[PDB]
Amino acid sequence: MILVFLGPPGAGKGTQAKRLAKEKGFVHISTGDILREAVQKGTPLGKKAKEYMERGELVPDDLIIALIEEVFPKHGNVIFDGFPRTVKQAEALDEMLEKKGLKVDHVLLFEVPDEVVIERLSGRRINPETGEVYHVKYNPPPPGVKVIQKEDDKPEVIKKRLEVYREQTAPLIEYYKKKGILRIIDASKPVEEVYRQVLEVIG
Ligand SMILES: Nc1ncnc2c1ncn2[C@@H]1O[C@H](COP(=O)(O)OP(=O)(O)O)[C@@H](O)[C@H]1O
Ligand SMILES: Nc1ncnc2c1ncn2[C@@H]1O[C@H](COP(=O)(O)OP(=O)(O)O)[C@@H](O)[C@H]1O
């Protein structure tokens, strides 16, 4: 089974992807996590991607398409989490999979109002070393676990990221709807309730 998680930044896609991958045996492909690793390592991809990420912009399509070609699991279940982010990326994904006799089975849209998004992101804290994600209100980190607020989770960059999402990424909703594979998730609910709905729509 191949899944795509789609929706505004802060919707809880990474949180649910980690949960589903671990419980139901999926390979979790997070372009965000993979890019952040590239940046930390100072690879050619990382050095180029860094400036876009810092500004809240999307990394150029060709870079991301190449990355996915490089890391796509040949066999097994996959969750694409944060990819595709543009129509060109979605078209490239369809082409890649078709060459392998595969397809995207379900696209889950994590629906959540802008106001909730802003609250999710502004309160997001991460463990810089493990990438583990917390929320100052909804899932506070234990004391003694060192967390930070990501620079791209500050008000100005959140605003940009949501604008970029609406312009470039939201059209994927209609792209996938017309393939018949879109399922709707109310991502505004608490974490366990959202997870139950994720299990429901793919079962
Ligand atoms: N598929 C992609 N295409 C282009 N850029 C991407 C992609 N995935 C991640 N990025 C870059 O990494 C940043 C963080 O991505 P991600 O971790 O998916 O988002 P979020 O902060 O909403 O969880 C994005 O704002 C963008 O700069
Ligand atoms: N259902 C939920 N209710 C409340 N907070 C959540 C929920 N899901 C995730 N969060 C918190 O919201 C923030 C964004 O979650 P994340 O998984 O990083 O979203 P995305 O990957 O869609 O950008 C994080 O701080 C996370 O702890």
Curated annotation (Swiss-Prot):
GO molecular function, one term: adenylate kinase activity
Keyword Nucleotide-binding appears in the UniProt entry: yes
Binding sites annotated in the UniProt record for ATP: 10-15, 120, 124, 133-134, 189
A Pfam cross-reference name: ADK
Catalytic activity: AMP + ATP = 2 ADP
Region NMP, annotated ranges: 30-59
Enzyme class: transferase
GO terms for biological process, alphabetical: AMP salvage; nucleoside diphosphate metabolic process; nucleoside monophosphate metabolic process
Domain of life of the native organism: Bacteria
PROSITE patterns cross-referenced by the UniProt entry: ADENYLATE_KINASE
Region (LID): 123-153
Subcellular localization: Cytoplasm
Keywords for this protein: ATP-binding, Cytoplasm, Kinase, Nucleotide biosynthesis, Nucleotide-binding, Transferase
Residues that hold AMP according to the record: 31, 57-59, 82-85, 89, 161
Residues passing through the membrane, by range: none
Location, primary (coarse class): cytoplasm
Cellular component terms per the entry's GO annotation: cytoplasm; cytosol
Assembly and oligomerization: Monomer.
Protein function: Catalyzes the reversible transfer of the terminal phosphate group between ATP and AMP. Plays an important role in cellular energy homeostasis and in adenine nucleotide metabolism.
Similarity annotation: Belongs to the adenylate kinase family.
Domain remarks in the Swiss-Prot or TrEMBL record: Consists of three domains, a large central CORE domain and two small peripheral domains, NMPbind and LID, which undergo movements during catalysis. The LID domain closes over the site of phosphoryl transfer upon ATP binding. Assembling and dissambling the active center during each catalytic cycle provides an effective means to prevent ATP hydrolysis.
Name of the protein in its database record: Adenylate kinase
Lineage of the organism: Bacteria, Pseudomonadati, Aquificota, Aquificia, Aquificales
